[PDB]
């Protein structure tokens, strides 16, 4: 891991190897690659918190692959989830 | 033998010491003045002193425990008479208490091994069922022989009544009025939902407790516990349960209105050093938002606010709202969300919400009924959770009308009422409010009317004593100033270390000021001077006649903004612990309100 991480800019090969489900496109793969790792949170002595973890939002016409790579990510992460709204869902996205 | 172990145990009572001071000896001497009939214990303290009890209390605990109880009672009996001989019949067994921190093992990694041993663990609470009772000493008379007897039971709150003392079987009545009992409850538990498999529902477990180990806990309180994996009753099977022998709670998880009110004495002296500085106000303004830039005038209101104001009652009941109400208003950036994130931290017992109510959160009292007996109970409220506190809101824009109404009533009387079918409520809110805005497409509102954000043009300039356009129009250097103010946060900790060296100087950290706030919030007895009366009646009539013209020009004013500075001035003087007031801060008063009238123009 360290050998390859330090040797000459892995990240092109990250987005080359993220999700070959669709050939698709590199940009949103890169966005969600940032979404994968999570950053670093901190607090200024326990106040003025900063969020280390990353968010994303995609959108566009349904004709293209929108509900594929996220389930792939569910298959690929650690402690991921594929929840959903109503219908074909694990849980209702709340607590109760 | 057993008495060897009893002495190996009882020497630990009075012949143990650390940091050159007796610990448990005088602990008991105190507990007996408390009339407590119990103690506290650590078991870490027993490992070095002695190894003749640990490895056997481990695997045969119930065999060893009531021994300790009796040893304790033995120590009690001497010291009772000795202290009666010193100064100034019925002494039961003392519940023992203990704790530990050696480890925590989860419910998942259990098995049917190490059963009846003692285990350590984590989890989350649900149950507060009922005070179910048991017996400890109960007298018996026979119905024919009239043959009195007696029974007492010890731990298991093994045998039954006597089958024969002709009287036949079951000859015995249980007398109550000379019998004795104790309480327990049935307490549940379930694991951390964050440390679970992706798929399945969770597994819970029951437990039982006794006299003074009762009623310590209320749900949601994450707690660690140690107990004995006991048993009671497919093909042939018995139910697994646990017997408590140690509980430890976080001191105070979710904020309890029944909080601490009797502070220590050492803190008074630094409190009053901070009472008597002239720099009080300026320090608080330098420190409420140390990683935050400008808007000094905005940060200069919060201190007027958190300290409340003139709780004043009159012989009809028309109280005046002791606190004040506020409304930020402006754009992205400009720290309108970050302070609100912060304020709960500095806060002792207040609450935060989004709008519409949050997930499973009634923005007011969302009453419903009982899972059992189908009965009525007042459940919740984001406006009554925080009784005697502030409330923080973001996205005030998208209210529901029914949601907006009661909150719209609180900020002028702070008392909700619900009178649905059977239940009739008057539940006291008694809270302060922090708002937050969503300007439609941002900045052009200053070019436009006061409003033209949302369709409450009424309540804005009516129910609010602090309303501010919160922006600067992209000065090319303020950007760089705030950027370099803030970039040092993320590493180098120079913004943090400056607060370190300034608290070493004249600043205060989070909790010292928290306690200062709590203390003055409940201590002071403010008032204002007759001399200070006219100073602002003049200001009032002048601002009235002034904007009469400029608002008659075809471009709000209230008795409430008149009545508001009445209480803000008292707050800023309150900071100095001021049972009176002078112009010293009345000048700052309109110095800070003028921002509101400037906004009132535009």
């Amino acid at each position: 891991f360290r050998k390859i991480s330090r040797d000459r800019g892995i990240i092109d090969k990250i987005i080359s190897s993220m999700a070959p489900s669709i050939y698709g496109h590199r940009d949103i793969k890169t966005a969600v690659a940032c979404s994968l790792f999570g950053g670093v949170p901190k607090n200024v002595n326990g106040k003025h918190s900063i969020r280390g973890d990353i968010n994303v939002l995609l959108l566009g016409d349904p004709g293209t692959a929108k509900s594929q790579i996220l389930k792939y990510v569910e298959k690929t992460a650690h402690r991921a989830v594929f929840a959903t709204g109503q219908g074909a869902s694990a849980v209702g996205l709340t607590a109760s | 033998d057993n008495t060897e172990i009893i002495k190996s145990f009882k020497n630990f009572i009075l012949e143990f010491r650390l940091d050159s001071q007796f610990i448990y000896r005088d602990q008991l001497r105190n507990n007996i003045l408390v009339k407590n009939y119990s103690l506290t214990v650590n078991m870490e303290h027993l490992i070095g002193y002695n190894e003749d009890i640990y490895k056997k209390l481990s695997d045969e605990p119930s065999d060893i425990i009531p021994l300790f109880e009796t040893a304790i009672t033995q120590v009690a009996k001497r010291i009772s008479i000795l202290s009666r001989a010193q100064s100034a019949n019925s002494l039961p067994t003392f519940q023992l208490i203990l704790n530990s921190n050696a480890n925590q093992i989860p419910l998942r990694d259990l098995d049917s091994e190490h059963v009846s041993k003692i285990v350590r663990l984590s989890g989350i609470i649900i149950s507060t069922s009922v005070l179910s009772s048991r017996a400890t000493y109960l007298s018996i008379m026979c119905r024919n022989c009239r043959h009195t007897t007696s029974i007492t039971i010890n731990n298991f709150n093994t045998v039954s009544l006597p089958r024969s003392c002709n009287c036949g079987p079951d000859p015995y009545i249980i007398i109550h009025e000379s019998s004795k009992f104790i309480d327990q409850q049935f307490l549940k538990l379930q694991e951390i939902p964050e440390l679970v498999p992706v798929g399945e529902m969770p597994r819970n477990l029951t437990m039982t407790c006794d006299r003074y180990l009762t009623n310590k806990v209320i749900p949601g309180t994450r707690v660690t516990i140690v107990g004995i994996y006991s048993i009671y009753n497919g093909v042939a099977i018995r139910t697994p349960y646990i017997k408590i022998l140690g509980i430890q709670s976080d001191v105070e998880t979710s904020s309890i209105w029944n909080s601490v009110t009797m502070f220590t004495e050492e803190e008074e002296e630094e409190f009053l050093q901070l009472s008597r500085n002239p720099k009080l106000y300026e320090i608080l303004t330098n420190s409420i938002a140390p990683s935050i830039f400008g808007n000094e005038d905005i940060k200069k209101a919060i201190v007027c606010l958190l300290m409340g104001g003139s709780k004043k009652i009159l012989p009809d009941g028309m109280r005046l709202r002791g606190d004040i109400n506020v409304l930020l208003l402006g754009d992205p950036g400009t720290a309108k969300s970050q302070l609100l994130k912060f304020v709960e931290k500095v806060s002792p017992i207040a609450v935060y919400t989004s709008g519409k109510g949050s997930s499973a959160a009634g923005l007011t009292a969302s009453v419903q009924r009982d899972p059992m007996t189908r009965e009525f109970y007042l459940e919740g409220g984001a406006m009554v959770l925080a009784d005697g506190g502030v409330v923080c809101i973001d996205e005030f824009d998208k209210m529901r009308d029914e949601d907006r109404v009661a909150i719209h009533e609180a900020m002028e009387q702070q008392t909700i009422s619900i009178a649905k079918a059977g239940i009739t409520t008057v539940l006291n809110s008694r809270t302060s409010v922090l708002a937050a805005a969503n300007p439609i497409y941002g900045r052009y509102d200053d070019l436009k009317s006061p409003g033209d954000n949302i369709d409450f043009q009424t309540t804005i300039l009516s129910r609010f004593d602090m309303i501010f356009i919160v922006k600067d129009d992209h000065n090319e250097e303020r950007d760089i100033s705030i950027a370099n103010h803030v970039i040092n946060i993320h590493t180098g900790n120079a913004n943090a270390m400056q607060n370190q060296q300034e608290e070493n100087g004249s600043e205060i950290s989070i909790e010292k000021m928290k306690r200062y706030i709590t203390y003055c919030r409940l201590k002071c007895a403010p008032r204002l001077s007759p001399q200070a009366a006219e100073k602002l009646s003049s200001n009032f009539v002048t601002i009235r006649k002034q904007l009469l013209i400029n608002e008659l020009e075809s471009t709000p004013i209230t008795i409430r903004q008149l009545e508001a500075i009445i209480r803000i001035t008292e707050s800023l003087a309150k900071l100095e612990l001021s049972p009176i007031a002078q112009e010293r801060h009345v000048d700052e008063a309109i110095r800070l309100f003028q921002a509101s009238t400037m906004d009132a123009a535009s």
């Binding site: - | 009075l14 000896r25 010291i79 000795l82 202290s83």
Partner: protein
């Protein structure tokens, strides 16, 4: 296998133990293989198992092995499948007085000695309750001198025990029960061996009494107390503050 070794090594209470655990194993095996042998509670199922396994190997012993309704049934079923002293002239057994001696949890060797005494000299009697009473009393006073030497609360509890185990309110007869056997059993080499073992000699040591009685003043009548006594009594008043 635990329970097997348990019940098998319950017989005492070289090739024997081995062959008998093997026997019970393959016996239980044969008995449970077929569908022929059922409604046999495992409560009791390793006993005439053990008795016939005694019958098999080489030597068998009718006594002390079976030690009842279904005992016979299952046997055939498997075997096909394959006051006290006014009472004049009473009678006793080995295990009757093993009980009356084992009530004090005394060892079995002393009991066997009283048994030998009996079965040789139970011939010319009037009442053996007296003889065995006195016997086991003078076993207790000789072996239990330590606890009594430090606890004189014992001598009342013990005599009360044997006063009502044999159902009397009068007791001086028991006093006679002791001194007469002591007159009788006074001088046998085994009695001698016990007195050198547990060291009463009227309840007092040798190296003391000989100077008590030869003619001395160095004789230590311990009116005074020993040093360790005070060394430990001091702790009681150390914490006198409380």
């Amino acid at each position: 296998q635990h329970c097997v070794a348990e019940v098998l090594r319950l017989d005492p209470q070289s090739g024997y133990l081995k062959k008998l655990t093997n026997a019970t194993s393959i016996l239980y095996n044969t008995s449970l293989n077929k569908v022929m042998l059922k409604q046999d509670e495992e409560v009791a199922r390793c006993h005439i198992c053990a008795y016939i396994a005694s019958q098999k190997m080489n030597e068998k012993h009718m006594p002390d092995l079976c030690y009842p309704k279904k005992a016979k049934h299952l046997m055939n079923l498997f075997r096909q499948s394959l006051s006290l002293l006014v009472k004049k002239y009473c009678k006793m057994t080995t295990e009757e007085i093993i009980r009356l001696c084992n009530d004090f949890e005394l060892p079995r060797e002393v009991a066997y000695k009283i048994v030998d005494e009996y079965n040789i000299n139970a011939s010319r009697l009037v009442c053996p309750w007296q003889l065995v009473c006195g016997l086991v009393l003078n076993c207790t006073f000789i072996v239990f001198n330590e606890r009594r030497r430090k606890d004189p609360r014992i001598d009342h509890f013990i005599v009360s025990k044997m006063c009502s185990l044999m159902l009397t309110s009068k007791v001086d007869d028991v006093i006679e029960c002791v001194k007469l056997v002591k007159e009788l059993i006074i001088g046998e080499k085994w009695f001698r061996d016990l007195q050198i073992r547990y060291d009463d000699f009227d309840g007092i040591r040798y190296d003391e009494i000989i100077f008590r009685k030869l003619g001395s003043m160095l004789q230590t009548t311990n009116i005074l107390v020993t040093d360790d006594q005070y060394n430990i009594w001091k702790k009681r008043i150390e914490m006198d503050l409380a």
